[PDB]
Structure formats: C-alpha cells, structure tokens
C-alpha cells in the first residue's frame, strides 16, 4: 500500500496495494477524468499489456518523486 | 453556486464527487 497515485480520489491509496503498476487501460474513451497513468495500486504482472499501457513493478523507485501535480 | 462544488481528483483534496 501507499504506492503513489490513487484510484479515483486522492489522499488515500486504493485498498489493494500489493504491486505498483502503471496500468493505462483506457479501453474505450476511458471512464472518469483518468489518472496520472494509473501509476499502480494492484497485483503483479498477470498478463496486462496488449493495448493497455502498463509498467508493473514491486515498488523500489516506482513512486519516489517530487509531486504529482505541476502548476 | 461558487466555492461550494469542486472537482479534486489527481491530488489536492479528498473525496471528489458525492
């Protein structure tokens, strides 16, 4: 838990934070206001890929960054 | 209707909608 980004709202860090994976499955016109390339907060590389732009990683330099926003 | 509603998301504040 506490990877980097968040599911929909901020502050929290999703319920399942086993592996941090930058999954971007826009599928079709995405859903809500999207996210910062869904940095992660899910399971490990289970197959993913194919269309969905994801970069799975078990932390260790996945989130260590200055900030999310950037005026 | 002014500073009542606000869409957070991404990073800044808590719960977005209601």
From Swiss-Prot, chain A:
Expressed by the venom gland. Pfam families: Toxin_cobra-type. The record marks 36 as: Binds to both neuronal alpha-7/CHRNA7 and Torpedo AChRs, may be important for inhibition of GABA(A) receptors. It comes from the Eukaryota. SUPFAM superfamilies: Snake toxin-like. The keyword Nucleotide-binding does not apply. InterPro entries: Snake_3FTx, Snake_toxin-like_sf, Snake_toxin_con_site, Toxin_cobra-type. Negative results: the monomeric form has no effect on alpha-3/beta-2 (CHRNA3/CHRNB2) nAChR. It does not show any blockade of the nicotine-evoked release of dopamine and does not affect ACh release. Does not inhibit the homopentameric alpha-1 glycine receptor (GLRA1), when tested at 40 uM. Monomer, homo- or heterodimer with cytotoxins 1 (P60305), 2 (AC P01445), and 3 (AC P01446); disulfide-linked. This is Alpha-cobratoxin. It comes from Naja kaouthia (Monocled cobra).
Swiss-Prot record, chain B:
Disulfide bonds join 12-13. It is found in: Postsynaptic cell membrane; Cell membrane. Upon acetylcholine binding, the AChR responds by an extensive change in conformation that affects all subunits and leads to opening of an ion-conducting channel across the plasma membrane. Pentamer of two alpha chains, and one each of the beta, delta, and gamma chains. Belongs to the ligand-gated ion channel (TC 1.A.9) family. Acetylcholine receptor (TC 1.A.9.1) subfamily. Alpha-1/CHRNA1 sub-subfamily. This is Acetylcholine receptor subunit alpha. The gene is CHRNA1.
């Amino acid at each position: 838990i506490r990877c980097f980004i968040t599911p929909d709202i901020t502050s929290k860090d999703c319920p399942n934070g086993h592996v941090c994976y930058t999954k971007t499955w826009c599928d079709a016109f995405c859903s809500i206001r999207g996210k910062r390339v869904d940095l992660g907060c899910a399971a490990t590389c289970p197959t993913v890929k194919t269309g969905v732009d994801i970069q799975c990683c078990s932390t260790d330099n996945c989130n260590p960054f200055p900030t999310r926003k950037r005026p | 209707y002014r500073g009542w509603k606000h869409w957070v998301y991404y990073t800044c504040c808590p719960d977005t909608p209601y």
